[PDB]
Structure formats: C-alpha cells, structure tokens
C-alpha cells in the first residue's frame, strides 16, 4: 500500500522510466518515532536507477508515481521492506516507514 500525498509543484509529466538513473533528496522518518536517515545531511544526493532491486519495494513503487520537482510523502507498509526481519539495530521488526521524497533527477 503506497499512499501518495504530493506537495504540488514540479511539472507533472517528466516521469521516471526503465533504465533511468534518478536523484532523490530523500529523508527518512519512523512512525511515532525519531529520524533515522537523511540524504541532506551527507549532501550526497543518492544517485540510483530503477529496476535492479537496489532500493526497497515501497520506495521503488513510489519512485515511478512521481515526476521532476515534485514532493511526495510515502507511507511504506511493513511487508514490503523489513517488517519480518528488520535491519539490525536500525529498523525494528514490524515497522512502518515514512519518507520525505523530492525528485530532482536526470535522464
């Protein structure tokens, strides 16, 4: 269940497609919890492509449903990323993830 709530501006037509490397200033957030990740802190804006199972499923499906300049608000379900296992020390088991996603990409 990828639920998109978009802060408006952008163009609404430059869509991410296959074989495209894209750049996101993401920001992580735990539901009823504190922060755990920010690409804005390291100032390295996480160049990545679509389709090679690099990122989690909840962030992968949220990437194609956006466009350039847009600003969405993900809500990743536990069953798509880590809810059975959980990343050791960082992500607890059965966790629901919140992401502040802005797409400022190329290709």
From Swiss-Prot:
InterPro entries linked to this entry: FKBP-type_PPIase, PPIase_dom_sf, PPIase_FKBP_dom
Compartment(s) of residence: Cytoplasm; Sarcoplasmic reticulum
Subunit details: Identified in a complex composed of RYR2, FKBP1B, PKA catalytic subunit, PRKAR2A, AKAP6, and the protein phosphatases PP2A and PP1. Interacts directly with RYR2.
Identification of the protein by name: Peptidyl-prolyl cis-trans isomerase FKBP1B
Tissue spec. comment: Detected in heart muscle (at protein level). Isoform 1 and isoform 2 are ubiquitous with highest levels in brain and thymus.
UniProt catalytic activity: [protein]-peptidylproline (omega=180) = [protein]-peptidylproline (omega=0)
Function field: Has the potential to contribute to the immunosuppressive and toxic effects of FK506 and rapamycin. PPIases accelerate the folding of proteins. It catalyzes the cis-trans isomerization of proline imidic peptide bonds in oligopeptides.
Gene3D superfamilies for this protein: 3.10.50.40
Keyword Protein biosynthesis: no
